[PDB]
Amino acid sequence: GDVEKGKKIFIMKCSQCHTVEKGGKHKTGPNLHGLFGRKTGQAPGYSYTAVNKNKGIIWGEDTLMEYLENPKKYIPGTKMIFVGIKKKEERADLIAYLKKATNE
Ligand code: HEC
């Protein structure tokens, strides 16, 4: 996917609620650094819903592809208030950006 496009998607659709940098602060949503290969609900010091805490999946390329299409379908009860990203290419660009930025 395209990291620069993915970065723009992130800035416009996610960055008001999320940071990605190491040590980034929690806002409405959790800091996302380290997300890849980690279970749901593991950002240190963030208070998740019980459903996000107990979803029990590992974040990676394919689970982010599904989740970001319709968060509340993937985790009913989530407090992430976000309709989703319908186009797979936008999702794939965004996820390429996250795999860089949350690992950098
Ligand atoms: C822009 C498309 C994004 C992307 C890529 C993500 N979010 Fe959010 N998010 C928000 C809140 C309140 C939560 C916690 C939800 C809960 O506890 O039920 C989340 C959670 C996530 C995750 C899961 C993180 C984990 O550690 O399991 C992920 C992968 C994620 N988000 C990605 C809040 C918001 C928003 C507030 C209005 C907005 C906009 C976004 N998030 C957008 C995005």
Swiss-Prot record:
Q: Cite the binding residues for heme c.
A: 14, 17-18, 80
Regions annotated as coiled coil:
none
GO cellular component terms given for this protein: apoptosome; cytosol; mitochondrial inner membrane; mitochondrial intermembrane space; mitochondrion; nucleus
Which disease appears in this protein's record? Thrombocytopenia 4: A form of thrombocytopenia, a hematologic disorder defined by a decrease in the number of platelets in circulating blood, resulting in the potential for increased bleeding and decreased ability for clotting.
Mutagenesis / variant outcome for changing residue 18 to A: Loss of covalent heme attachment
User: Which biological process annotations from GO are given for this protein?
Assistant: apoptotic signaling pathway; cellular respiration; execution phase of apoptosis; intrinsic apoptotic signaling pathway; mitochondrial electron transport, cytochrome c to oxygen; mitochondrial electron transport, ubiquinol to cytochrome c
Instruction: Tell me the superkingdom of the source.
Output: Eukaryota
One GO MF term: metal ion binding
> Its biological function?
Electron carrier protein. The oxidized form of the cytochrome c heme group can accept an electron from the heme group of the cytochrome c1 subunit of cytochrome reductase. Cytochrome c then transfers this electron to the cytochrome oxidase complex, the final protein carrier in the mitochondrial electron-transport chain.
What does changing residue 41 to S do?
A: In THC4; increases the pro-apoptotic function by triggering caspase activation more efficiently than wild-type; does not affect the redox function
A Pfam family per the record: Cytochrom_C
Which parts of the sequence carry N6-acetyllysine? Answer: 72, 99
Q: Which residues carry this modification: N-acetylglycine?
A: 1
Effect of changing residue 5 to A/D/R: reported as:
No effect on covalent heme attachment
Write out the similarity annotation: Belongs to the cytochrome c family.
Q: Which species? A: Homo sapiens (Human)
UniProt's post-translational modification comment states: Binds 1 heme c group covalently per subunit.
Q: Give the location in the cell.
A: Mitochondrion intermembrane space
- Which gene is this protein's source? CYCS
Keyword Calcium found: no
Question: Know the name of this protein?
Answer: Cytochrome c
Query: At what positions is N6-succinyllysine found?
Result: 55, 72
Q: Which UniProt keywords apply?
A: Acetylation, Apoptosis, Disease variant, Electron transport, Heme, Iron, Metal-binding, Mitochondrion, Phosphoprotein, Respiratory chain, Transport
